[PDB]
Design a protein around this ligand. Sequence first.
Ligand SMILES: [Mg+2]
Ligand SMILES: [Mg+2]
Ligand SMILES: [Mg+2]
Ligand SMILES: [Mg+2]
Ligand SMILES: [Mg+2]
Ligand SMILES: [Mg+2]
Ligand SMILES: [Mg+2]
Ligand SMILES: [Mg+2]
Ligand SMILES: [Mg+2]
Ligand SMILES: [Mg+2]
Ligand SMILES: [Mg+2]
Ligand SMILES: [Mg+2]
Ligand SMILES: [Mg+2]
Ligand SMILES: [Mg+2]
Ligand SMILES: [Mg+2]
Ligand SMILES: [Mg+2]
Ligand SMILES: [Mg+2]
Ligand SMILES: [Mg+2]
Ligand SMILES: [Mg+2]
Ligand SMILES: [Mg+2]
Ligand SMILES: [Mg+2]
Ligand SMILES: [Mg+2]
Ligand SMILES: [Mg+2]
Ligand SMILES: [Mg+2]
Ligand SMILES: [Mg+2]
Lengths: 80, 107, 70, 50
Amino acid sequence: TKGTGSFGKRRNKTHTLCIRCGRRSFHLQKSTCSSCGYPAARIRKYNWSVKAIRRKTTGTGRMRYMRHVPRRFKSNFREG
Amino acid sequence: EVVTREYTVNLHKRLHGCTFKKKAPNAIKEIRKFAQKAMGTNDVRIDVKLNKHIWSSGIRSVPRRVRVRIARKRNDEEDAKEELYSLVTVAEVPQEGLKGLGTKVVE
Amino acid sequence: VSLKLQKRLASSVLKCGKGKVWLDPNEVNEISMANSRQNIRKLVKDGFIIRKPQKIHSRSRARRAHEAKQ
Amino acid sequence: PSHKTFRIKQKLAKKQRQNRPIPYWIRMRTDNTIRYNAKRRHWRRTKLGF
RNA sequence: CGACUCUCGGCAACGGAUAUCUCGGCUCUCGCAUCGAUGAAGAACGUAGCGAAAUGCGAUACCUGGUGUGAAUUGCAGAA
RNA sequence: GCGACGGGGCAUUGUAAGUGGCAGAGUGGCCUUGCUGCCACGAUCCACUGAGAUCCAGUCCCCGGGUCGCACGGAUUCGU
RNA sequence: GGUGAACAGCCUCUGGCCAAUGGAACAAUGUAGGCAAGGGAAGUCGGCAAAACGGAUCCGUAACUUCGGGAAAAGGAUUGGCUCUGAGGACUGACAGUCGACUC
RNA sequence: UAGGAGGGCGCGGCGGCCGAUGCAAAACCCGGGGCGCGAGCCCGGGCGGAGCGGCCGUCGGUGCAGAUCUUGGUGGUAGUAGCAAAUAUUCAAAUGAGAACUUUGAAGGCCGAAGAGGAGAAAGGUUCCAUGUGAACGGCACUUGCACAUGGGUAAGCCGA
Ligand SMILES: [Mg+2]
Ligand SMILES: [Mg+2]
Ligand SMILES: [Mg+2]
Ligand SMILES: [Mg+2]
Ligand SMILES: [Mg+2]
Ligand SMILES: [Mg+2]
Ligand SMILES: [Mg+2]
Ligand SMILES: [Mg+2]
Ligand SMILES: [Mg+2]
Ligand SMILES: [Mg+2]
Ligand SMILES: [Mg+2]
Ligand SMILES: [Mg+2]
Ligand SMILES: [Mg+2]
Ligand SMILES: [Mg+2]
Ligand SMILES: [Mg+2]
Ligand SMILES: [Mg+2]
Ligand SMILES: [Mg+2]
Ligand SMILES: [Mg+2]
Ligand SMILES: [Mg+2]
Ligand SMILES: [Mg+2]
Ligand SMILES: [Mg+2]
Ligand SMILES: [Mg+2]
Ligand SMILES: [Mg+2]
Ligand SMILES: [Mg+2]
Ligand SMILES: [Mg+2]
């Protein structure tokens, strides 16, 4: 029946890890991430969840490159 | 004071009406109670051959009488609650059977 | 002085069931010092660790039965 | 399972390197407030979900 | 005389209120205009003598170089 | 005296193991037998045997019948 | 492995266990499982629950029927152990020899 | 009562005035003394260890017993209900501070092979193995462990992909 008997039959993964965002949201059969929208070129995000936006905007990671643009703007991007 | 004596224990009347999965386990307990009153020893050690005898017919058929010898001895082990211990063992028996055997004292 | 590592590795070395392994009850310390399959095989040779014989299941009563159904 | 991918084996390896109590000398540093590892994981209590 | 129940006081518990704080938040105002195929934002894995996280960094990996300063870093050890 | 054995009484079941049997449906083998032969197998039957086993555990009796073993108790409290 | 038609149930060998908190006692009321003189559904909304039947061999089997069924209808008898008797075979050179596991 | 108004009390800032405090501020505690019809207030004693108060004006996230109110903490219930499926354990010895529960030996039992046996797919992710261990955890306990700590361990032209 539903409930305990039916919960024993979880054996098959609907989602697995996504290469682009890293979350367990890649739907194997549909072949698209439910979180970031991969393989769609643009990223999946909505204005009806501002909280989900701020979990993944700029600044929540390293900013490997854009961290240094403020310092380069001062000194007007000098090239040695 | 060391003494060794021969006893006949009527296990039948002691275990009368006992649950089957407990009779031979309760037979061990009544051997132990018997010896404690027999020698005034709260420490009774049952020899492994006596244990084998009581279990020979399984768990629910226990010998109706047993001839044992009880030997009071010394706790030569310095670390012990009490001075003495008992060693209850199985005892050889004549072809006359248990006919006429009272409590004999071993030489 | 638990001898679990020795009761196992005796079954495996003697290639038998764990209920058929006999470790000598009077020299647990020699057994307890052997911590290896090599050391167990040495105890095997010295008679400190034997293989208990198989329990008895005879077909005499079946043979007599079949020999009376003839 | 025994059949796994390299990518899953890689992530499982990192998860193991992170199940360790903090070094004792961390507790001695100036202006320290770390008491214990607050992220320790046990395979039977919290599943990785991956 | 006692036990139990209720009660008053003293002491001791339980718990974290109150007070006193504050490298945090909130609000207002000002200045400026700077991401990306020359591969961004984001994700992953690595990386320290002793480190898991955070912070930092990329096999040159808690840094290399230049310049300024001018004698430390520090939980322990070591070259100094 | 008590306790444990043991003996007797009382009772339940229904004739123990072993021994022997010119008991036993029959069936093989071997004798110069000759039958009322000798060996071997054989459910059951018969005598020893109203036997054997059990019998207070909530049964009865036991001082000349018997074998034994026992403590000289620890501990707490009470004045009308 | 044995019983048996049987991967049924029941017992055993290889291998594996005795892991399910223990001790004492054995009131009511429970729960699970039995048995009950005489009667036999009178109980109850109601045969609910239980009991009765049950394998195999031989015999025998009605109405009705779409002629295939009904049918394992119904109704009877038998069943252990022991000691025998007969039948049913193979190969080898209407015979001789040897062998032979199984059924009735 | 519903309702309206006046005069007060109390809390926190701001502008001003007047002050207390390491010779002990705030907060809290008391069978301490008093004032006021009351809201409240003043003092004593203690605890504490660094801030605080009164008056005028002005301002506000300004007064709780309730909302099956929100969050946290705490009782009675109560050492109570309860720990009862899967037949079952017993004797010696070792160990140990401590053994009904660990280990060895012996005995008695069970699964009875469409298994309580031996191996895999999925799923898990180090649970595997050794050594050690204070607490916690293993709804009794434990010397013990699928726990904790430190180490070790997965080898392919032929098995797979
Ligand atoms: Mg549904
Ligand atoms: Mg399915
Ligand atoms: Mg699907
Ligand atoms: Mg009874
Ligand atoms: Mg789970
Ligand atoms: Mg007889
Ligand atoms: Mg007779
Ligand atoms: Mg058969
Ligand atoms: Mg079968
Ligand atoms: Mg009746
Ligand atoms: Mg009726
Ligand atoms: Mg009626
Ligand atoms: Mg009626
Ligand atoms: Mg009616
Ligand atoms: Mg019915
Ligand atoms: Mg009909
Ligand atoms: Mg305010
Ligand atoms: Mg308010
Ligand atoms: Mg309140
Ligand atoms: Mg109100
Ligand atoms: Mg209780
Ligand atoms: Mg229950
Ligand atoms: Mg099969
Ligand atoms: Mg292990
Ligand atoms: Mg516990």
